[PDB]
Write a protein that binds this ligand. Structure first.
Ligand code: HEM
Length: 460
């Protein structure tokens, strides 16, 4: 009943005196570690660290409440507070109440309109064609390093649709320097929070390396802008709105400083997670041959022209289901954080004070046997045939509310287009019997996943 229930004590994993649980994050796979703890302690547990108290939730029951924007706003997890050192008050790393969140949210959203989207398509195809031709052009016994390639595609794509700028990742056999520095900057951000003594001079090489990478990323931004300054455009894209658009509420455009932060934020946000998704989707597909056949058969049946049209991607009802079923198991942005607007009580049993933080552990949420069934670890896209059979807030890979992913249609449309084309033009083989090894650079990816494609010989 309403509150008939009585105060339950909040489970908590081993503490270590005055560092609390911080030692449990001694691992290069903290999300995976936290999933193990939630397996032990169930739907909710406290997790402290010097200058940090948060609460991890893993049940649809509790996340439903947490996602109630009348009761909880978006919080910056410690992870995001650190990433903020180089992503500034760009969209992902600003607070809802901060002036530049609202300003930029208003100025930029048009870039994700239906009309905008229809125009990104031809460019997505441009890049998608490159990926395919790269794979068409491999010799026999040569293999595909899947995440390195998905990253080439997704970064080239955001670069082109967002900024009219070509990274030409497919013309490099190593990763683009941006990617390299991004990864290091991100991996440092994650490390700064397993650290009890941030100022210990053993970390002074890290610090210097961090500024080195940040300069690398900014020099790319410099290039991106100069290239825009030096031309007449066709483009009406993200960058156009960043440089020229004015807030409807104030009449002001973004300042140069914040513009530089949005560019970094979109370069990262706009590829990183989508690459993870495409890498995971491909994984589950080769690991579940019968599912691949069904998807490949939809591709063949739907993608009848040499290159796909916007309308055709939308007809790929089953590939879409595959993508969603990949996000369910390994949501490439694996957490987001909320705080209580007022003193309250969550789920009838656990009181919170104003300001108290929560963290939605998305991989655990997506594994709630109440919601999905027993076979929770089984990859099965068919769970998505009926959108109404999935409760609200049971499936949340794009976050929640005002601060939900504005890039979601962009991302699925890209992934759907590319996966479709892959399935249409290749037969795949898990020649190594790859063992899944998930790397966490603050987002997730299947590290070292490799496959062999065999061309179906369909011309482009
Ligand atoms: C599979 C692909 C993607 C996934 C899984 C994903 C996931 C998410 C999640 C969970 C959040 C919420 C963050 C939070 O509440 O702390 C978010 C925010 C955001 N995403 Fe995505 N996203 C994807 C694709 C994209 C793309 C393609 C773009 C841009 C082209 C993008 C741009 C952003 C931005 C700007 C935010 C912050 C928006 C705001 O808070 O105002 N994302 N994303």
């Amino acid at each position: 009943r309403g509150s008939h229930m009585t105060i339950k004590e909040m489970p908590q994993p081993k503490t270590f005196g005055e560092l609390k649980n911080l030692p449990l994050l001694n691992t290069d796979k903290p999300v995976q570690a936290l999933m193990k703890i939630a397996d032990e302690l169930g739907e909710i547990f406290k997790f402290e660290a010097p200058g940090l108290v948060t609460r991890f939730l893993s049940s649809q029951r509790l996340i439903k409440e947490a996602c109630d924007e009348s009761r909880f706003d978006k919080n910056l997890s410690q992870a995001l507070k650190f990433v903020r050192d180089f992503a500034g008050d760009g969209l992902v790393t600003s607070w809802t109440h901060e002036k530049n969140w609202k300003k930029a949210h208003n100025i930029l959203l048009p870039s994700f309109s239906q009309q905008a989207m229809k125009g990104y398509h031809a460019m997505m195809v441009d890049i998608a064609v490159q990926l395919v031709q790269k794979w068409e052009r491999l010799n026999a016994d040569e293999h595909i390093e899947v995440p390195e390639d998905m990253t080439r595609l997704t970064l080239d794509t955001i670069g082109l649709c967002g900024f009219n700028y070509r990274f030409n990742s497919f013309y490099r056999d190593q990763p683009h320097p941006f990617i390299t520095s991004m990864v290091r900057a991100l991996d440092e951000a994650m490390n700064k929070l397993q650290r009890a003594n941030p100022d210990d001079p053993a970390y002074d090489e890290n610090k210097r390396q961090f500024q080195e990478d940040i300069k690398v990323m900014n020099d790319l931004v410099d290039k991106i802008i100069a290239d825009r300054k030096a031309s007449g455009e066709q483009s009406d894209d993200l960058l156009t709105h960043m440089l020229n658009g004015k807030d409807p509420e104030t009449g002001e455009p973004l300042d140069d400083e914040n513009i530089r932060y949005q560019i970094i934020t979109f370069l990262i946000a706009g590829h990183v997670t989508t690459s993870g998704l495409l890498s995971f989707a491909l994984y589950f597909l080769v690991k579940n041959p019968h599912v691949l056949q069904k998807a490949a058969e939809e591709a063949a049946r739907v993608l009848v022209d040499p290159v796909p049209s916007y309308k055709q991607v939308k007809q790929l009802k089953y590939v879409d289901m595959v993508l969603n079923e990949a996000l369910r198991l390994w949501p490439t942005a694996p957490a987001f954080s909320l705080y209580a607007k007022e003193d309250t009580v969550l789920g009838g049993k656990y009181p919170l004070e104003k300001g108290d933080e929560l963290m939605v552990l998305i991989p655990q949420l997506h594994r709630d046997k109440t919601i999905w069934g027993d076979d929770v670890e089984e990859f099965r896209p068919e769970r998505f045939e009926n959108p109404s059979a999935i409760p609200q807030h049971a499936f949340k890979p794009f976050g929640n509310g005002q601060r939900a992913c504005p890039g979601q249609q962009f991302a699925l449309h890209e992934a759907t287009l590319v996966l479709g084309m892959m399935l249409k033009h290749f037969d795949f083989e898990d020649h190594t019997n790859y063992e899944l090894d998930i790397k966490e650079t603050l987002t997730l990816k299947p590290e070292g996943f490799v496959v062999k494609a065999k061309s179906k010989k369909i011309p482009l």
